[PDB]
Symmetry: C2
Subunit: 384 residues, 2 copies
Amino acid sequence: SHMIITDVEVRVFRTTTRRHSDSAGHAHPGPAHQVEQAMLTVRTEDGQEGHSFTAPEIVRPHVIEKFVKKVLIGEDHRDRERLWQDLAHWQRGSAAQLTDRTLAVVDCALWDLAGRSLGQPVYKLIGGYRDKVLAYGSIMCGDELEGGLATPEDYGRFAETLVKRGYKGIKLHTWMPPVSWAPDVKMDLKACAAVREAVGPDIRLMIDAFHWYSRTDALALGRGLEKLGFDWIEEPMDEQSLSSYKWLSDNLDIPVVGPESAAGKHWHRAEWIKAGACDILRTGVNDVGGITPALKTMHLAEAFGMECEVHGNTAMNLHVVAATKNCRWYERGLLHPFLEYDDGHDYLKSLSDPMDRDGFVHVPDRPGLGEDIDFTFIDNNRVR
Amino acid sequence: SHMIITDVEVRVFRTTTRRHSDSAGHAHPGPAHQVEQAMLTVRTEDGQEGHSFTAPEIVRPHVIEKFVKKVLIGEDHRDRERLWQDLAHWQRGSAAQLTDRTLAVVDCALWDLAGRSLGQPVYKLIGGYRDKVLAYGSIMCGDELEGGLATPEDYGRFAETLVKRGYKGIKLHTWMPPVSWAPDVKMDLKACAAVREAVGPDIRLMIDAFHWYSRTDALALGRGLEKLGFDWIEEPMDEQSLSSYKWLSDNLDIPVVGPESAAGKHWHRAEWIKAGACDILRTGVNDVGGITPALKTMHLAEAFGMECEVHGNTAMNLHVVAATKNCRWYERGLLHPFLEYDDGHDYLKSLSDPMDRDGFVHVPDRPGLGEDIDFTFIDNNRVR
Ligand SMILES: O=C(O)[C@H](O)[C@@H](O)[C@@H](O)C(=O)NO
Ligand SMILES: O=C(O)[C@H](O)[C@@H](O)[C@@H](O)C(=O)NO
Ligand SMILES: [Mg+2]
Ligand SMILES: [Mg+2]
Ligand SMILES: [Mg+2]
Ligand SMILES: [Mg+2]
C-alpha cells in the first residue's frame, strides 16, 4: 500500500519575472516584478512525491477540495488512466470550474510521481523515441516597444539573432490587440517578409497570427505566406468554427496547423482530422488536459499519417515530444530580444530544455519530469 | 549503461497440449501431443531480462540475425518507440520475412523487461485503468466431434456450462472448412438460436463466423443475428475488402466489429474508422505488432468515441485491456467442452488470466507481463 496517495498539496510562491500578460492574455516583456506561481504536490504513503507548476487559480482550494482530493486520495497513484477519466467525468457537472488546465496539472504531477518513484525520466517510462529534438524559436506576440517587436524590421533583426543561437526553425507571433493599430494583415506579411529576407530560404518559418481574423483576412494572410515559402499558418481564426478551418485549408496550399485552443481534448481533435480542418494536428499538455491525453492525440494523428505539433514549452511538453515520432519540433519560447530565455526561472536550479548550438534541445537525464526544483527558494518565497 | 541491451535469445521447447490446428489454421481439440513453442528473451547489461512466447518460425534465426539483433543490441531497452519504429521501417524491404508477428513478440519482450526491471506490472507502467475486467467465453471453431461442437445443440449445451462458470458474455466461432459441409449460414444461425435459447436474454452474445462469406451471405447472417439480439458480428467477410465492410455495416443494424486480421496496424485501422467500415474497432497485440501499437489503436478508437475490442487471450492482451477504458471485454479462450482452460499450460506455474465466479479476470499483481514462467520446465524440455 506504499503506492496509495495520501496527500494533495498546493504551495503558492512568488517568482520574479519580466514577463507580463496584457488584458487579452498575451505575453510581453515589461518591468521585473513578482508574480504568484503555484506548485501542486501529490504524495504517497511511502513519502514519494510528484510535482507540477501552474497558475494559482487553476489549483485554488475550491478546485482541490471539491474535485481533486476526492478523486486522488486513497487511490493507487499508478492508475493514471482511471484517475484521469474520473476527473474528466466530473467536468460536465463542475459549474465550469473543473477545467482542462486543472486536469493537466494533476496528470503531470502523477506522471512526475511515477517517474520520481522509479527513478525514470517520464519519456523513458512512456517509451522513448528520441533523447534530443530540434526546437523552433517561438517569438513573443508583437508590441509597440522601440527596438523590441514594434516593426517588421524588428522581427528580421531578432530572427538573425535566433539563427546565430542555433535555431533551425522560427515561428512569428505577430501583432494583436491591445496593440493600438492591430491587427493588420499587410503588417503581418511585412514582418514575415523581413524574416525570410534575413534568414534566407533554408530556415523553416511559421506564423501564429491574430486569432480572430475573418475567413477573407486569413485567406489573404495565407496567400501572402505562400509567396514566402512558410511551412505553416497557425490559428488565424476562431477555432470554435471547424467549418472555417475546413474552408481555409481547402483554399490554401500552405499547411494549416490546429487546433491549439479548442476544447474537447483528443475527442474533438479527431473531428478536425475527419473534417479535413487542418493539414497538421496540434496538441499540448495544457490544451488537452495532461500528458495522458496529449499522448492520445499524438497516436491519433500518427494513425492518420499526420504530424501533431506540441504547443508549449516546459518539461511536460518536452517529454511528450521525446516519447513520440510524428512531431517535428519542441516549441522553445516565448522569446523576445529584451529577454534571455537561457536564464531560466528563479524557482528552477537549471533548464528543463537546454539547447545546443546546433538547435537541438536535450532532454535532461533526471527522473520524473526532470524539473530541477529549488524547494528552498519556494519555501523562502511563500504566499500561501 | 545498465539499461543497454546485450543479448537477444530464443529458446525452443516442447509443450504438451491437446490443441491442434487444421490446415486452415483453426484450433480443435485432439490427441495430447508435444508441440514446439518458442520463448524470446531480451537481456540488458545488468542482467535483467524480459520474455515473451510465440511460434518458433516467428523468431527463427533468419529473423533474429537479419533484423531483430541489428535493431536491439546496443540500444537502451526503454526506447520502445524508437525500437518499434526501426523494426517497422525494415518490414518493407524484408522480402516478407519481418512480419507483424515478429514485431509483436519483440515489443512484448521489451515491455516485460521494463516491468520486471522496475518491479511493475506492465499495465501499471502504462497507466492503469482497471485491475479486473469482464471476460467473454470465446468458443473454439465448430467441428465434427460427437458431443463437441458438431451440432447447434452442442453449442447450446456448452453455453449453459459457460454461464455456470461465471461468463457474462459468450462468443461463438461457428463452422469453417475443412469441416466437410461448411460453411452454411442457416447452420450458423441455428447454433446462435440454440445458444440464445439456452442462456436467455441477459447474457451477451457475439459471433465470429466463417471469414470468407460473400456480401449477400454475410448480410443474411447479420439479419438472422438481429432477431436473436446478438451484440456483434465479427469477421464474416474477407477483411482485405474495406468496401465490403462499409456496405455490410451500412446495411446491418447489428454492430460489425473489425478489422481483426487486416495488415497495416493502427494506420489501416484509422481507415476503417474514416470509411465507417465497422461500428466497433478491433485490435490485438499479435494483429498490430505489439503492445505499443495496440495501445495506439485503442487511443485512436477512443478519440472517435468508439470501443476497440482486443483480440486474443494471454498476458500481453490482458495488460492492454487493463490499461484502457474503451474495451468491454478480455477474450478468454479458445474454449471447448473437451478441454479445461483453467488447467493452463505446462510451461507456466499459474494462470495469467484467472477468472472469478462472477466472470471477472483479475490481472496478476506480478511484474512485467506477469507470466509465471517455469524456466526449469523449459530447460528440461528444450529442442533448440
Ligand atoms: O496569442 C497568444 O498569446 C499566443 O498565440 C500564445 O497562445 C502562444 O503560446 C501560442 O499560441 N504558441 O503556439
Ligand atoms: O478462424 C479462426 O481460427 C478464429 O477466428 C481465430 O482467429 C480466433 O482467434 C478469433 O478470430 N477470435 O476472435
Ligand atoms: Mg499557437
Ligand atoms: Mg490546403
Ligand atoms: Mg475473431
Ligand atoms: Mg449498421
